[PDB]
Amino acid sequence: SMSVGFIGAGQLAFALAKGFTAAGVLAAHKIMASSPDMDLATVSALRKMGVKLTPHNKETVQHSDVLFLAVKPHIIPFILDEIGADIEDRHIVVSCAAGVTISSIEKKLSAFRPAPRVIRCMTNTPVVVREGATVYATGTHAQVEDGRLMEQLLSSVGFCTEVEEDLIDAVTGLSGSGPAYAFTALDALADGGVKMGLPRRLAVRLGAQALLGAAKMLLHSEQHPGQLKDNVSSPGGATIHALHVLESGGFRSLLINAVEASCIRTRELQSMADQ
Amino acid sequence: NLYFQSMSVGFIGAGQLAFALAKGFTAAGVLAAHKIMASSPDMDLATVSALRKMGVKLTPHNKETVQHSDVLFLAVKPHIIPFILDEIGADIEDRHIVVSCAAGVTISSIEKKLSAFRPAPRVIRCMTNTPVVVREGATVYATGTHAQVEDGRLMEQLLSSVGFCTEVEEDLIDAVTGLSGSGPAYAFTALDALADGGVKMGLPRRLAVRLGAQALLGAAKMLLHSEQHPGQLKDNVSSPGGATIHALHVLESGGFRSLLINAVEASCIRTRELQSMADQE
Amino acid sequence: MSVGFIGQLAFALAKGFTAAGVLAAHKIMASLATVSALRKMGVKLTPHNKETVQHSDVLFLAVKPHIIPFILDEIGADIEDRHIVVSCAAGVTISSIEKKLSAFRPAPRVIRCMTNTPVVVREGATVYATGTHAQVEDGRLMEQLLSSVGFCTEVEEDLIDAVTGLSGSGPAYAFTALDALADGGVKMGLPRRLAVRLGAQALLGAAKMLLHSEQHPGQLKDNVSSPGGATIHALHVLESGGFRSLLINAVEASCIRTRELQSMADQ
Amino acid sequence: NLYFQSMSVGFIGAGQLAFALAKGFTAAGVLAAHKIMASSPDMDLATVSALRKMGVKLTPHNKETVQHSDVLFLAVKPHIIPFILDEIGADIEDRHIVVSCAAGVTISSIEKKLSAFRPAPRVIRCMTNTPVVVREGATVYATGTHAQVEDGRLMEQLLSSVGFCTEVEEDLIDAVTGLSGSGPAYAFTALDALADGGVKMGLPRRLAVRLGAQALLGAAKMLLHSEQHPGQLKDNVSSPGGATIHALHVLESGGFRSLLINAVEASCIRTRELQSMAD
Numbered sequence A: 001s002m003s004v005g006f007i008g009a010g011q012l013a014f015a016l017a018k019g020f021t022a023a024g025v026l027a028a029h030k031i032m033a034s035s036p037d038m039d040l041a042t043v044s045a046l047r048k049m050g051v052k053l054t055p056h057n058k059e060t061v062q063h064s065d066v067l068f069l070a071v072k073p074h075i076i077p078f079i080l081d082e083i084g085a086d087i088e089d090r091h092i093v094v095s096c097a098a099g100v101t102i103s104s105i106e107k108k109l110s111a112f113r114p115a116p117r118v119i120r121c122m123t124n125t126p127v128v129v130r131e132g133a134t135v136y137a138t139g140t141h142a143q144v145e146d147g148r149l150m151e152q153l154l155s156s157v158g159f160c161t162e163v164e165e166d167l168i169d170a171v172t173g174l175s176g177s178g179p180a181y182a183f184t185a186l187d188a189l190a191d192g193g194v195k196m197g198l199p200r201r202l203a204v205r206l207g208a209q210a211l212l213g214a215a216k217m218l219l220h221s222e223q224h225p226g227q228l229k230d231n232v233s234s235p236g237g238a239t240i241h242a243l244h245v246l247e248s249g250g251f252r253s254l255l256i257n258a259v260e261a262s263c264i265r266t267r268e269l270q271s272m273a274d275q
Numbered sequence B: 001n002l003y004f005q006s007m008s009v010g011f012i013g014a015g016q017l018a019f020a021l022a023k024g025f026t027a028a029g030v031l032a033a034h035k036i037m038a039s040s041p042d043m044d045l046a047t048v049s050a051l052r053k054m055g056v057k058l059t060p061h062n063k064e065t066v067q068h069s070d071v072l073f074l075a076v077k078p079h080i081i082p083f084i085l086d087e088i089g090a091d092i093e094d095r096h097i098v099v100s101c102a103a104g105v106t107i108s109s110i111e112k113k114l115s116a117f118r119p120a121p122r123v124i125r126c127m128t129n130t131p132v133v134v135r136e137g138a139t140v141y142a143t144g145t146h147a148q149v150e151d152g153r154l155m156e157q158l159l160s161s162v163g164f165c166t167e168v169e170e171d172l173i174d175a176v177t178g179l180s181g182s183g184p185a186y187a188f189t190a191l192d193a194l195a196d197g198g199v200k201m202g203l204p205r206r207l208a209v210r211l212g213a214q215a216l217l218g219a220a221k222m223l224l225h226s227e228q229h230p231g232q233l234k235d236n237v238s239s240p241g242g243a244t245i246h247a248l249h250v251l252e253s254g255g256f257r258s259l260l261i262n263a264v265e266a267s268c269i270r271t272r273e274l275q276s277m278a279d280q281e
Numbered sequence C: 001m002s003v004g005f006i007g008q009l010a011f012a013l014a015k016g017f018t019a020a021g022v023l024a025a026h027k028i029m030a031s032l033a034t035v036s037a038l039r040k041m042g043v044k045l046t047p048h049n050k051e052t053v054q055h056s057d058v059l060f061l062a063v064k065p066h067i068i069p070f071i072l073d074e075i076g077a078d079i080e081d082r083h084i085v086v087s088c089a090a091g092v093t094i095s096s097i098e099k100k101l102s103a104f105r106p107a108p109r110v111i112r113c114m115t116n117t118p119v120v121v122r123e124g125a126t127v128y129a130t131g132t133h134a135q136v137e138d139g140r141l142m143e144q145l146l147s148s149v150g151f152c153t154e155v156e157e158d159l160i161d162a163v164t165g166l167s168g169s170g171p172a173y174a175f176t177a178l179d180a181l182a183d184g185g186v187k188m189g190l191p192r193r194l195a196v197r198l199g200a201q202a203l204l205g206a207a208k209m210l211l212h213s214e215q216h217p218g219q220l221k222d223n224v225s226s227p228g229g230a231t232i233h234a235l236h237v238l239e240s241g242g243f244r245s246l247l248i249n250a251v252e253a254s255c256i257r258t259r260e261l262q263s264m265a266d267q
Numbered sequence D: 001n002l003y004f005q006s007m008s009v010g011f012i013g014a015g016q017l018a019f020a021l022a023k024g025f026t027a028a029g030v031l032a033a034h035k036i037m038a039s040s041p042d043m044d045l046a047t048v049s050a051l052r053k054m055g056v057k058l059t060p061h062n063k064e065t066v067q068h069s070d071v072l073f074l075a076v077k078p079h080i081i082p083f084i085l086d087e088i089g090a091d092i093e094d095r096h097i098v099v100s101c102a103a104g105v106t107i108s109s110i111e112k113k114l115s116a117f118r119p120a121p122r123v124i125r126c127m128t129n130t131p132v133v134v135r136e137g138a139t140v141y142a143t144g145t146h147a148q149v150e151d152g153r154l155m156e157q158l159l160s161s162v163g164f165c166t167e168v169e170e171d172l173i174d175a176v177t178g179l180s181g182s183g184p185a186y187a188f189t190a191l192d193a194l195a196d197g198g199v200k201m202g203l204p205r206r207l208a209v210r211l212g213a214q215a216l217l218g219a220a221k222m223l224l225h226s227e228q229h230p231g232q233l234k235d236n237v238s239s240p241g242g243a244t245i246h247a248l249h250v251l252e253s254g255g256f257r258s259l260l261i262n263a264v265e266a267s268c269i270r271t272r273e274l275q276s277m278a279d
């Protein structure tokens, strides 16, 4: 029955609308999206999906029950001023804009109506193939049923759980930025395959399949990742020789640096949102 | 396409690979567990206990596995193979398809051993990986001299039920070992580290493990279902000034890409070394 | 129309403009090494900045960033309403120029521009941001003029520091790279002149391929490298030295330094 | 100038380099697309479909390419050149000019194999690169033992239509491979990284790609059209205390120059290794 809105038509809003349509959890005609600059590829992609489109962010608000904000962080204060008068009591405001705090949203929206129902969301692009990783934090006036609605909605396109808002910066550095780390790794792994004689296309396919299978093994396993690493590495063998050169470059610490750098940049954005 | 419901499969070795392939095959429903025999040097393994409860038949006699099976998976260490080939060589019949999974061991080395017993052994060489156990493996195979056309097609249908499977020329399989053969251990290492980073930044350990693994799987599936270069997807998900591009920069400053190239090379080279040392003896 | 200059960037723009036929070289007045060349082109040279302002319609300011305030104080009273003041000085913000000029006349038409030296062969990269009092047609006029000597597009002013780090400093990164590539060719036995020519032609062709392709640079990279071949071996050693991260460091350092100049200009 | 529009051109290999040369030659107008024939062991390549739409005749028989062509480009992998030469050596005629593009394959090795079928094979070795597709390639060539005076001239004319082309001694070509052969890949890596830097500092990706590429194009054009040392051009653009000289310093602190020297060397050394593994 319910309707879903997207303010913004970027990569992430497209990913959610496509993953939601592929889940059949609501008919695409229940979905509206507004961008003042939407590219015709994203227009023709969403329109063929059945996703209703408009340039007027207020049209989305009046159409929608659940309202996704998927725009750049600095654009958010302008959005809230535009649509703030149109926020009804029925609306659930789900922010995806990175580092934008529930406080900064509730402050803006409280100038119009006193109890805005706000949820902060950290999701990632693989929702487009329904394998996203999502966390959400509920705001001051979000009713308990709102969090469940959020949970059921985002569970149709990947993993989803509730966290305290203070962990969302860290989730950003981990699962939010994660897919870009994977894409970088797969491009380098394939370069390695090419270096050793594989055709590029086959190298790309084999590396991506190996990553997926490994991650799936861990998800469906009780065991520590180090234990599964142990089970792959035969004595004297090729895998342990490879693991050694990874260690010599400090491979593990680079991934730690990455999550940390992304979380800290997210906090730097959280401060400008709160300033 | 092909009818192999009444086909018997054997494993020489009952290690991580025999267990992973048998679990995948019986989970795919293309093999009844009681049509699978495995032989192991010792029966005090955790792998044999799980094969027994799976319904797989467990013998200590390699010749018994050979007599029971039509397709014969050789899943032992690379330096054992010429001793297995000696023990069972006379037991090999015309009906047998011998599938070697040892890293490095060449089709011609196996054909040479077996030919001393019977002239036209049907040999296939393959490189698979442990995620066959959840049916998301990556497998390549090459066909030997006396491999029939149906033999490669039969092998590809078998291994496709537990992951991606394609045919390659044999001289690529060492490279493949370094990529998808060792690939899972690189992912496990990467996931352990990513989870340490999540923990450093405040997340509970179990949630950090869960989120990194889900991030890796979804990204891999994204690429497998996309017609786009991995760099384009990197580009697509990196907003200007954002957290992700800042993280990408510190990966680059450590030479993250070169380490993965180093790893694939080291594994492929070690795989070639193991064969050379074997062929010297 | 008429154009004036108030450098190595002043020469480069006048050279490209004339070669494009967009402006008669004599409708151009400027105010060193580049003084012998410019006069040869039939471009009017005058030592008095005030003469340049009185003759010109469009006014490029190509001086050192801490030198603009002194020029503005000097010519400010001579800025009529027909004038468009285009600042190319690195880091000098639109606000700082308008502040100076507005003590003389309330609505100065200011445009801020980040262009680079390859305008001299009409392959520049130019961005520009329109000032508080510039009408729409001032932006379009500027876009038409600088499109004649390379790529040109409008940006928000807060992207110009980033553009400085990418295409503004870019040509020096390429000159450093071609000098090193030529040292490499020389090491492997090529004559120096042949190595310089072949390296620069490789760079040019590669850049033109990317400008004319719909594909990602990584996709074009894949196409060069045959399996097991020479190119992928060379790519590996680039990766092992963190070659990509150095170029990221470069754009970042240039952009940050531009911001620090942008502060000295606003202080 | 030599007249050659009506000659037929053959590619053994319908891969990335055969496509690049065919695309460049047809866009230059020096050959008609229907006068080109290419052969490949694999017809499902994206490049093979691209050649079809151009009007290039595609066959899976290396024999037919030879019989169709006057000039014959060898754009196969290096190690398979020996099997190709045995396969079509009997079909080589006196009218044929054989042009090897394979990295590292020496004129001596080609002439040795081909001399077994008919003496005086006309062989030319060249190293070119993918930007021929936009007619800005970099090509060197060396004439073989039995190449006529005209064959080198005809070869230079053909390849100058798609970029720079000059004659070199054969012992320089391995070095040219590491420089202009692999060159474009170094530039693509550079452009990707520069765009990453632009994005980090806040530019949209597409804008950073365009600006980075345009910066490199115009820098390269400046150098080619000036008589000045790359170092003098670097000096001319680095104002004192400015943003550029700050960025140059971080480049130097990472040994940026040495990485590019390492790259040319590695590619050239690998090019030699490949020929020594053949021999």
Ligand SMILES: O=C(O)[C@@H]1CSCN1
Pocket: C224, C225, C226, C229, C230, C231, C232, D103, D177, D181, D182
């Ligand atoms: O990597 C390679 O072999 C190709 C052929 S020479 C330069 N690029």
